Amino acid sequence: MESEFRVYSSANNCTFEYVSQPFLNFKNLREFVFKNIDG
Amino acid sequence: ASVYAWNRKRISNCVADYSVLYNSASFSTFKCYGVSPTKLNDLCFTNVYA
């Protein structure tokens, strides 16, 4: 059971929020590419 | 809200149809400054503060 979230202490000025569909021996291989081009 | 504590709602990541508001008969003032109401339904903005 997931009952522990300790990643932040505050959230003051939000510009953008986006809720989406979930993306997700070792059985799974997940490749991701993150790019910051022209905003 | 009261005018001293006016509510601000940030509107992002959706489609804003302004012709529904402009063609309503329920509004007495629809005074736009800096832009015309006819091209609001065409133009695109980063955020909307209500």
Ligand SMILES: *[C@@H]1O[C@H](CO)[C@@H](O)[C@H](O)[C@H]1NC(C)=O
């Ligand atoms: C950012 O947050 C601080 C404190 O929460 C506030 O004083 C400031 O006016 C905010 N700026 C914007 C642009 O929202």
